[PDB]
């Protein structure tokens, strides 16, 4: 996995130069295992990864400030890229261009909500299923 | 140093006190039981797999 070690470093940094170096340096292994289109869809999701980190640690970052810290050109390109990120649903924020900021979703305390209900519902269903399958298969010979 | 249940807020510049609900000992005991059952399923790995 070392080639993927280098690739992950490049993507995390957002260093397209190092990404191109890694592609030119281990491209054969990628075409061998079979990844060579996913590793360009990478380029795409590399800019996406940048925006996800930005929207993971921020609550109201202004666009002119995403342009820079995401390595973009202009607030217009910021508008488009962040909007597409939200559309793909990887950052989960709103946006406001009346003043130009990208306020996220005020996290709601998820214990006065049905999310715990649902999670424990999946897990309880699972546990009951294993009890069923385990009490079953207790074959006795005669 | 945990002298009273309050949190500052350096925006409007305001100190907000509150009563911290006691840690629900039910979930504490529950997590302890999850860990112990992890030990049990490990022991059961050993038994089952190595006698079968």
């Amino acid at each position: 996995l070392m080639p993927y070690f280098l690739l992950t470093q490049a993507v995390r940094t957002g260093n397209l130069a190092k990404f191109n170096q890694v592609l030119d340096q281990f491209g054969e292994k990628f075409q061998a295992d079979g990844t060579y289109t996913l590793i360009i869809r990478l380029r795409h999701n590399v800019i996406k990864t940048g925006v996800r980190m930005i929207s993971l640690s921020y609550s109201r970052i202004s666009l002119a400030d995403i342009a820079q810290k995401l390595q973009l050109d202009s607030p217009e390109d910021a508008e488009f890229i962040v909007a597409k990120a939200i559309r793909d649903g990887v950052i989960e924020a709103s946006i406001n261009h009346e003043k130009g900021y990208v306020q996220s979703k005020e996290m709601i305390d998820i214990y006065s909500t049905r999310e715990p209900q649902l999670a424990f519902h999946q897990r309880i269903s699972f546990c009951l299923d294993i009890h069923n399958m385990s009490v079953k298969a207790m074959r006795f010979p005669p | 140093d945990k002298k009273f249940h309050g949190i500052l807020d350096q925006g409007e510049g305001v100190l907000i006190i509150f009563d911290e609900p006691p840690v629900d000992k039910t979930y504490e005991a529950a997590l302890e039981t999850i860990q112990n059952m992890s030990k049990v399923v490990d022991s059961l790995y050993n038994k089952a797999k190595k006698l079968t």
């Binding site: 214990y111 209900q117 | 079968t52």
Partner: protein, 287 residues
């Protein structure tokens, strides 16, 4: 006055037996008798009963012959048998009241000023107690409506001494219900609770419809209680209740989830034990 009337299984069975032993030999509809019991504060404890000859004309509705000489002699005999039990009213096995009832209560008020009429319904219904208890009240109505001698409800219950629990338990052991909450039984209990709530709401609606259309007069006591019920209805769309409900539902389901995980681990352990037992048996049989 008296607030509560706790009737006993012996009284109920005695009434059933009276009704059967007269209906077999004739057809009298009602059967009428006296109730014997003791007070304790304002809580009547009916602990015995006995039939008193009765006969009435179902047409005239004011000709009847409850036999007070028989009542007195019979009460003398039961006073000799057991003395801590004095006449505390009467009973009749008719599904509904009758015009005579007030006159009969006036007769029995000679032997007990605080008379309690328990209309023990022999027919077995599936929703309510078989006893409904009434007491006669004449008083100037506060609303200025003309006053007449009519009955008033007194809360009723069924309870038993230990000497009678030992009997009811033995008689019902065959078709008894486990005195413990099996999850199926508890879900059944909740379904039956919904049944009962529906039945009561239908009764209230039927009465209100009759009142509105006019076939019945308005009872201010009933309207008071109904509007107090509506007063007491709760609100669920309120936010700091939905929050609390979700919180405690989640806590309960954490306990449930931990229970399920423990059950899964135990089940797997038992499966392993059995597979090993079968493996050993197969190996030993082979060798």
């Amino acid at each position: 006055a008296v607030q509560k009337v706790v009737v006993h299984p012996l009284v109920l069975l005695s009434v059933v037996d009276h009704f059967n032993r007269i209906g077999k030999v004739g057809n009298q509809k009602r059967v009428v008798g006296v109730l014997l019991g003791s007070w304790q504060k304002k809580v009547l404890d009916v602990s015995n009963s006995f039939a008193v000859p009765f006969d009435e004309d179902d047409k005239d509705d004011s000709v009847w012959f409850l036999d007070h000489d028989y009542l007195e002699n019979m009460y003398g005999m039961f006073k000799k048998v057991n003395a801590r039990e004095r006449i505390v009213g009467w009973y009749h096995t008719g599904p509904k009241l009758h015009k005579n009832d007030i006159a009969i209560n006036e007769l029995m008020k000679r032997y007990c000023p605080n008379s309690v009429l328990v209309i023990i319904d022999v027919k077995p219904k599936d929703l309510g107690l078989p006893t409904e208890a009434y007491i006669s009240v004449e008083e100037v109505h506060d609303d200025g409506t003309p006053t007449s001698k009519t009955f008033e409800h007194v809360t009723s219950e069924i309870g038993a001494e230990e000497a009678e629990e030992v009997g009811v338990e033995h008689l019902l052991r065959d078709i008894k219900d486990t005195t413990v909450g099996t999850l199926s039984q508890r879900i059944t209990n909740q379904v039956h609770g919904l049944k009962g709530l529906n039945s009561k709401l239908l009764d209230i609606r039927s009465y209100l419809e009759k009142v509105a259309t006019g076939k019945l007069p308005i009872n201010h006591q009933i309207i008071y209680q109904l509007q107090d019920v509506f007063n007491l209805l709760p609100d669920v769309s309120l936010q700091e209740f939905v929050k609390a409900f979700y919180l405690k539902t989640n806590d309960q389901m954490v306990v449930v989830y931990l229970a399920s995980l423990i059950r899964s681990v135990v089940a797997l352990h038992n499966l392993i034990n059995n597979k090993i037992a079968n493996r050993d048996a197969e190996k030993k049989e082979g060798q």
